[model samples]
Target: HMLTNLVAEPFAKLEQDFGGSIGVYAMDTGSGATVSYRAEERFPLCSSFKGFLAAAVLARSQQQAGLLDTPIRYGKNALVPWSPISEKYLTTGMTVAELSAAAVQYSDNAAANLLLKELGGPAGLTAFMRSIGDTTFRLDRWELELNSAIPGDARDTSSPRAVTESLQKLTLGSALAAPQRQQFVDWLKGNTTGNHRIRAAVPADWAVGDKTGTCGVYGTANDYAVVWPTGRAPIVLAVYTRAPNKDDKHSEAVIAAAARLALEGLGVN
Candidate 1:
């Protein structure tokens, strides 16, 4: 019931939109098989790091104990270089809810820095990753520029295998329990960077929540989304690319291409 509403139609729409050298994967949690293409390779994960950070916090909260709605102070200096939160019109001193909104929805750097600090700083995040079985995911610095620190010309990165696996765990409500997952979902719904890729594919009425990251110079773009309405198997989709620089039209086309290849591979109409 829930799975049907959340996934089926949006998947169809995704298939119609993305088109290019992108990799995609959609595994039925009930079945373990993927409806995808080039689904195994690593690509620039972009701002999707926020998703992992959210899960990390959920895990940490469960291990420690805290209220999601608790208050957290925010200030200007905490904002990292090249972050959008610096542009917020409002002043500081918001609740965790407000911070989380900027962190996920606006992909705000300042909010993310605060969250990273609250989550126990960068070292804490690295330790948290190891504790949660993310050995391959190296989070050296929990700053907004996740992959920028890496040497020249590399896409902010992660493999589809890793990200989808994480998505599957989150979808099953096993990663951090239903309540925590729901919180992450709510934050995702507020994600402002949705106008470009996966979100653009699905119908306006469908509830599509996701995070997208686009790197301008090297032509690297990524879109990761979880589409769920009331019911239906949750569909986790990721699109990664390293194509020559192009406009949104070309970018969206590349994403749709990956989705179509995936759906067809999975036998979805």
Candidate 2:
């Protein structure tokens, strides 16, 4: 715990400079070493839950054959803010797999909500996380509503360590069947929202896949990722932030900075 405490000092300064609390957890799969700062503290899941929501669908696809191909048609009311991918396919309707990809790659709100319904809603997604041995993740509400980021409210929140561990299980471990696991990884690799977060911290040559969340309130936003360094095992990590004021703006640069510190603290380039 000394190492963890030692690694936290810079993060304290970083968070102070940004006017928010920064939570980070980075695991070196090869060495089993990690860097943690406020890793156990809860932060709003925000849009980041969409990533796990997509994974939950993939996990369910294992038992239900052709589930990924099932076409989902929803009314216009289901389309909420930030539903770009879903909006384009509104007329034709998108399949389960397509919606999952949209939710991951584009963070499409409607697609996430539709897939959430298929999984049985926020509680359904919460059950999926529990099935994988993660008890800290809880999705209590749907999109827009879940992003409120009220201080001290537990709704739709998870710890950074829990997020990284579950993400590792789903993406690189046995949480999902092989086919579905690869599909989830592919979806994360194509994500358009995380370029400025964890992805920006790792070297460009090192392959990485990530999901980002921006609650757009109280400076709450986060990103978790699996990074692959050449000739070594992959590293899994998470970065989360939140400030006191409702209008406090989250800084992508701060996320990137914290990520670099995580990697450096792990003795990884």
Candidate 3:
């Protein structure tokens, strides 16, 4: 399919331009049309996994009344580097919904850790992922603690395929109820990270909901998105790049170019 070739070409170029591997998975949500390049390769998710955490919390909220509304305080231990929550709400009380929003919208590490603790840490997230039939994703450690004794390769990780599957479930209302799923999508729409990646080349009027992940140690830049064209079905796209250096702008641009090509291939006007 044109979409397959379109998505593959730039990923190949990205591998050559950057020093490491790249993985991509793009799917038309309505038609089930798909494209991929190394979609099975495990890649560290970084903060991008926050979406799954948010989902886990929402899923649990289905059984526990007011779970999302329950207030929790942010203590000093929850603080981590690169956290807007720590900077703004340290020693303050915030509900689970507010914390989830901070974790998703701003990619707040502290907020995520707080939520993880509430969800019973990595084990809890692992159970949620498995319940959703996702086998390749793992959440083994807290943010900023990725440098601990655990092998870097064993840190929070997921394949492009796994991420796309999760996104598909989220879109199809299989992951959460309609209302909570809509809330999750709304949270994704509010994401402030990765403005220059998947969403960069998309049309201004079109809607793109996504999460971005960056790993300084592994030299990874990743974005997973659900793009809604003006009058067409939504597309789920996940791009992962593992480079030799940290935070490469060129790698991000490669993802942007891929996104544009995907839209073009999908015949989005």
Candidate 4:
């Protein structure tokens, strides 16, 4: 509470201006310092689950030899709306690795669903999170349906602290083997949709990898990342937001602002 109190006023002001609830948890891995604001509250995961989905895929690859390179073929019916990357590669089937990349980089709905099936469905993904010591993350439904963001519904929700901790483990800790861990970091680094969120807050030269989620309902959206400073250890953080009104809109600018404040709270230059 001593250190977390540093950002309390600013976080409250930011969420008030955005007309929503904002949850953030940031850790300076070097000093083990942290900033938490509503970090334990549950927020709809929306498309953010794709990041962990890719990690779980990487973990499974370690067990099932050649699993990542295995080719996967699907039909037109498998394609869902908002699946831009999956739609582009519809003619020729994509390998499991490609699907994982598409899911992470492009947030392709079809690629996510297909990969979710490969991981044995939502429960399997949840199981992987549990194995990694993440008790707060839970994916109860497939893509699209899981983005409902209905008030008081806990489906497909996780706490900011849990998301940040699990991401730190998988990306910078011992959750995955060497090859798979690097691969997970690579996929996240190549992400296209997250530039406006956490990436927008940090200095340009500092390396960063992030995943973004936009629920398009209840003003719900989030972004989590592993961020490297130029001359120090990397930082891990999660920022999530939700409003009571279903029609309330979300703002990426707010997320970036919160990220900057989190870094400031951690005393990062």
Candidate 5:
């Protein structure tokens, strides 16, 4: 009931300000039950793709007989030019775990590229996605190389319904081994870009884990977050938008709106 009212606040606000459709999905990671508002509506993945990359790294490493702790080299040659992580580190090498942290916490394009390389590139992640039973969606290019010859429109994304299902798998240790699952969860917990949309809605210390994507021109904004209260089970929430404003405040507004709607649906405060 509280959640329902919480979601109503933002939903109404967004509809008044943006004048476009917005979709959200928030579900229990443990049970697969949810409170949703047009969650089936699809939007661009944007940087949300980083979450998938994070999952792939965790999953692939776990599947490879425990390589999550193995360090990988991160030289200038290994880095993608004009990438954030590469530009920041300028180091020769780091562990796979470090790379995943950089990719997710910072949304560093270079960090994401390094992880993609470690996972055997775009096709490799796609293969991993397929193996995990994610066939309805398509990932044209790596998170870092979205604008680089990728054959797609706006990275052509999807909403929470698809990702909530994936999060449910991860929470249940279906996406990777126990260690990898915990590792991914930990990495996501360290995410620092709270200035993004979804991060603004949820409470701090609530164990919110996610990746956010934003495009300057196309008015694309999206986020995939997992809410795991310490005492309670985890819930996956996704909010995707193509608002005309396209600013941080706009994203915040939408997220706030989405949060209200989701909470209302779930009868939470």
Candidate 6:
């Protein structure tokens, strides 16, 4: 019943093909069956931390009405590279909910910073995560816009277990209230990144809610998800890959392969 042993061969093949650390964690919500590989090892979360950011914003919204509906303008000063919103929406005001959509669905860097600022910066996010009893994840800086001297370790980071546990808490309705939880899930299901990773190998009809992260030049690719198969319990899965080349798609493929193996173990087609 060890999911790790069941997929050892595929994982070994992945390590052989890609010369970097890779981690995977999957849990069955119904029976609590778990499988993981290097799930405890800390890896740069990259934009994957946006999921936690979104959750923090949503949780705050519950404490105050209109918190998510309030509109704010992000000017060119806030624009950064890899921002999907900067070019078109610069200097335009957008609601918190709208920014949340861009941050999660598109992984928009500018939008992420805007929300982070609204939430009182990285310290705010760190405090929220700790309030939830999660200490494995850390948020330290704003999203980088251009090439800077900041070290990789100074940015946001989390382990597979921490990210998976956060997702599990959200799925179990323990992280956020009912309405907020559903809102968060809806946003994740709308995620536009990483179509070729966790979502690549599962059944097309299966509902998958996930977030993807790519370090600008640090070569870290990550995807975390909550998959709901019809007539079956939900599955929480998280995968992280760190490589020397940020452009490499091999990590993404490895993630897809690992997901396929996990799905097989769960008897999910």
Q: What is the TM-score of each candidate against the true structure?
A: 0.75, 0.98, 0.91, 0.98, 0.81, 0.92
Candidate 1 residue 169 C-alpha distance from true site, Å: 0.8
Highest TM-score model number: 4
Consecutive 10-residue window with the lowest summed lDDT within model 2: 1-10
Q: Best-fitting candidate, measured by lDDT?
A: 4
Ranking by TM-score: 4, 2, 6, 3, 5, 1
- Estimate the lDDT of model 3: 0.79
Q: Report RMSD for candidate 3.
A: 2.5
Question: Which runs in model 4 stand beyond 4 Å of their true positions?
Answer: none
lDDT of 1: 0.60
lDDT of 6 by residue, 1-269 (tens): 56677777778777668776788888888887878888887777778888889999988987987899898786687778778764577756788998898899999888889899888998899889898889887788888732221334535777888899988887555889999999999999999897998999778889999999877554467899999998989999898877555554436787888778777766666
- State the displacement of the C-alpha of residue 173, model 6, in Å, after optimal TM-score superposition: 2.7
Residue 100's C-alpha lDDT in candidate 1? 68
Model 3 Cα lDDT, one tens digit per residue, 159-256: 99899899879755578998889989999999998799998977789887888887665457688888888767888888876754544433677778
* Superposition-based RMSD of candidate 2 using all C-alpha atoms, in angstroms: 1.2
Model 6 alpha-carbon drift over 4 Å, by segment: 145-155, 244-250
Model 6 — which ten-residue stretch has the worst lDDT?
145-154
Q: Write the per-residue lDDT of candidate 1 for residues 1-269, one digit (tens) a residue.
A: 12233444554555344432455666655445565444566566656677676767766666565645677665566656656754463364666656666767877667667777777776675566566565544454555556442323333366665666666566454667677778778878778886767765565666767777665434567777776533455566676664433442226556655554554444434
TM-score of the candidate numbered 1? Answer: 0.75
- Tell me which residue pairs clash in candidate 3: none
Give per-residue CA lDDT, model 2, range 68-102, as digits (tens).
99988888898899999888888889999999999
Error of 2 at 151 (Å): 0.5
Clashes of each: 18, 0, 0, 0, 13, 0
